[PDB]
Each structure stands twice: as structure tokens, then as C-alpha cells.
Symmetry: C2
Subunit: 173 residues, 2 copies
Amino acid sequence: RNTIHEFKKSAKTTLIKIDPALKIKTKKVNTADQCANRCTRNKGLPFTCKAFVFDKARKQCLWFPFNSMSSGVKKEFGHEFDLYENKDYIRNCIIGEGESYKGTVSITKSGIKCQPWSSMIPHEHSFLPSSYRGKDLQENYCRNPRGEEGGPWCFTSNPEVRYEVCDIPQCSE
Amino acid sequence: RNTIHEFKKSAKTTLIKIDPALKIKTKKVNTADQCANRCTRNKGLPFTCKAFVFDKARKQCLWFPFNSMSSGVKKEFGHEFDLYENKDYIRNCIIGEGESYKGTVSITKSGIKCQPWSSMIPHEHSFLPSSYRGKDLQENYCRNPRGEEGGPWCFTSNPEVRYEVCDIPQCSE
């Protein structure tokens, strides 16, 4: 099985450590699948593998014990990098109204698949990543970029349903 | 692609709905992979698929808008049943010291693969599911069955290291 699809992918991105005390392991490989497989199994890493980057140029994995939401870690844009975050370390429940939610649930509560944020079909809208930097309006993930009440939501791919809330649990239970 | 391995599998287990109003969807297939593909892609399902069960006698998927932790639903035994739970709806962060943690993390903070609980190798112990019922000492997941200071831990597959705490973040972080 290919463990690559079990990760949250963010194209053209890598991560940089502000605090350089945080450990890292690198290696040249061929495909990103190799980085995924290694990371998932965690065999060969003196730490818990939370995320990795595949350098497409150098053909190289960079395995991290941290991810984009870790303190003292910055995202950086780069044409050759693909970021892959292990979903186990992307909080899959919400605090409050869920403005900080970054998980990959992309289905509404009646079970309609979400429309991508940067598509205008079926529904036209202004909720684009450029209007909400840091709110992760990517793919078709359930989000609440304005921090409104009702929790994370999305435009549904049902022409007859403009938007619907998603059913994402609170961490409080 | 093959999604079945993206679920927490509980063997010999099904879920009975106690709440009379609760939705359930079922169909006859050959293998459980079919149930998993259907669940993940959430296709032809009037709810959000949080878990399914494969009946090996009937050769039949049962899809659920709930899982084993949902209120109004009971875990129940049967040799013919296998319970697959969508990892997006098992809290992946710990509240307090982690006694209620039911996630699938199974690596110690220093990268060691956990020894399965019901194994005696490399390390003999007494943390058997049969004397910790309710605490999900299954497979080799990090657990904290006595709710001790230190959070979830496991016995490790490394003969040199009996046990190690795991690195599972607090929901508030």
C-alpha cells in the first residue's frame, strides 16, 4: 500500500526551523512514496515522524519531528518542495468556533462533498486563499475563515445546496 | 486506491444502534475494501461516514454516521464482524493525562515501534486487554490505562528499552 495519500499535502512548500535545536533527518531517494513509507513506519528515525518534505529537484526526503503548526517553525514557499503532514498530528477536533481548524474533512453533515475553495462551480464566491492568508482555504476542506458561529463549513458540490456546515467534533467531547 | 488501511480496525466487533432514529446504510459486496472505498469517498451516503462494519458471513457493509465513542451506540462482539473507524473522528490529541485516548499512534517519543500489548516479547507484562476492559489496549497503540503522570506510553519492541512515553499533543496547543 502507498502511505503517501494518508498525509496532508501542501504543494510548493517547505518548513524552516527557527529554533535550530529541533532535530532533522535527510536522505536522497527517488520518489516521495519512499519518504511517506519511511515516515509512516517511522523505521530509521530517532524521533516521532510528524511531517516530511520531498525535494523534487534534489530528489531528497527531509523528515521532521514537527509540522507547520509547531511553534518555532515557519512555512516557506519553494518550487521544488512538497510538504506532507502526518494527519495524526493535525488536530482533528475543534476548539470553539474552529477558526484554527486545519484538518482534511471535506464532507458536509448531510454527506455532500465540498466544492474546492478556488473553484466557482457550482457556486460563485469570494472566499479565496488570497483574501484569507493563514486560514488554509485549500483543496475543498471544511473551514471557518471568518470565525463565525456554526463552525467550519464549505460550499457544497450540490448545485441546489450553496453551503452547508460540516460535522466536526469539539475536543471538549 | 486502497483506503482500508486508513482506518482503525477493531476485529470481531460491530456496533448496535441504541438510538432508534439513527441512520444506517448497507449493501452486499465481496470484500471490505469496497466498503472502505465507499466510506472514504463518501459516495451514495446520506450522512457523514465515520465508521463501517464488514460482516464476513453475510459479506456485507454496514455504513454509520457514528462510531464506537458516539453516544447512543454500543460496541458488541461477533466473530463475523470487523469494525473500521474513520481516523478523522477519533480524537488525536489528549485531554489531561490521556486515559481516554483512542488514537492509533504507536511510536515512542524517540522513534521506537511499540510492542503490542497482548504480546510478551520482548517484554513480559500484565497490561492485557482482558484486565483493562474499556481502555483499548489493542494492537500496539500508545495508551495510559491507569491514567498516570506522563501521558500515554507503551512497551517497546526494543529489548533494551522496556517502556517509553509517546509524544501525543494536548488538544490545547
